[PDB]
């Protein structure tokens, strides 16, 4: 109803956010296990990103899809805002990638399928996520991928967007150049993820931000030799400078590499 | 008001070595 901190038992930190930690929690009456995402009000106000939190709450609250992390509610006290989230027991894809170094083709294609299903649902609501990097992809109890952290998202029903957003390694040319952009930004990020999943490093990685920026703007990346011809085909189609040349999400879900390797 | 982290870092690089 009108949630408050006293309605939850608190446990260990699950991870560290920009504005506070995410804690394991339990709603007292139901005993149901959840996550409480904490944001410090003074931090938020100093950074001037209150609108990102408002969008996160306004957008993620209304999404209902098995591959999107649920946001159940929110509350605040004198110093903090709390978001009540679905708990993802198996952690981030980021940690899995660190542990395994790279994913085989079956695991990669299955994640891409789940990501494309989730993004299809988002884009049907005309929502753009814009920050789908591995530390924002969580894993449910059956190892299924869940898109989380909608603080960079936007509801873009008609107009194209111009906000500088997201995380450099995952952004397309039109977003790092601050040009107008649309839902095709998520298709580019999907190509970055597919490459990073198979290789272990995102394709434009460089030791300076300046070089990474230039590599992205000129689509300068190469494939290691173990990346198969089908994976190369998909990734190359997703990482097109021209947003309109990037495939539709239906075409990703139908790609012969995806259907031959995905278990989903 | 705060830009994405990468904007701040790339501006540092420019101020630091051009
Ligand atoms: N529902 C959740 N279940 C388990 N871990 C989570 C959950 N939400 C967040 N985390 C952990 O906390 C980290 C930060 O959460 P996130 O919502 O991405 O914060 P920020 O918006 O500051 O990036 C995630 O990378 C993950 O490690
Ligand atoms: C700051 O605006 C940096 C602009 N881009 C570069 O310096 C990239 C140059 C390159 O590596 O070719
Ligand atoms: Mg995050
Ligand atoms: Mg966030
Ligand atoms: Na890395």
Residue numbers in the entry:
A (entry chain A): 126 to 389
B (entry chain B): 72 to 89
Published text:
Aurora-A is a serine/threonine kinase that belongs to the subfamily of Aurora kinases, which consists of Aurora-A, Aurora-B and Aurora-C. The three kinases are closely related; in their catalytic domains, Aurora-B and Aurora-C share 71% identity with Aurora-A. All three kinases play important but different roles during mitosis, which is presumably due to the fact that their N-terminal domains differ both in length and in sequence. The protein–protein complex formed between the kinase Aurora-A and the oncogenic transcription factor MYCN antagonizes proteasomal degradation of MYCN in neuroblastoma cells. Complex formation between Aurora-A and MYCN involving a site in MYCN in close proximity to the Thr58 degron abrogates FBW7 binding to the transcription factor and hence stabilizes MYCN levels. To overcome the challenges that a ternary system composed of Aurora-A, MYCN and a small molecule entails, a covalently cross-linked construct of the Aurora-A–MYCN complex was designed, expressed and characterized, thus enabling screening and design campaigns to identify selective binders.
Specifically, positions 339 of Aurora-A and 85 of MYCN showed the appropriate orientation and distance for linking with a maleimide propionic acid attached to the Nɛ atom of a lysine side chain. As a consequence, the mutation K339C had to be introduced into Aurora-A to enable its ligation to the maleimide head group. The cross-linked construct of Aurora-A and MYCN was crystallized in the presence of ADP. From the resulting crystals, the structure could be determined to a resolution of 1.90 Å. For MYCN, only residues 72–89 were sufficiently defined in the electron-density maps; this sequence includes the C-terminal helix featuring residue 85, the residue at which the maleimide moiety was introduced. A Bicine molecule from the storage buffer is coordinated to the second (distal) Mg2+ ion, again exhibiting octahedral geometry, with the remaining coordination sites occupied by the side chain of Asp274 and an O atom of the distal phosphate group. The electron-density map clearly shows the modification of Cys339 of Aurora-A. Although the density between Cys339 and Lys85 of MYCN is not perfectly continuous, the propyl maleimide moiety can easily be modelled. The basic conditions (pH 9) of the buffer in which the protein was present prior to crystallization caused the maleimide ring to open, forming a side chain with a free acid function at the end. In the ANX structure, the free acid function of the opened maleimide is stabilized by the positively charged side chain of Arg343.
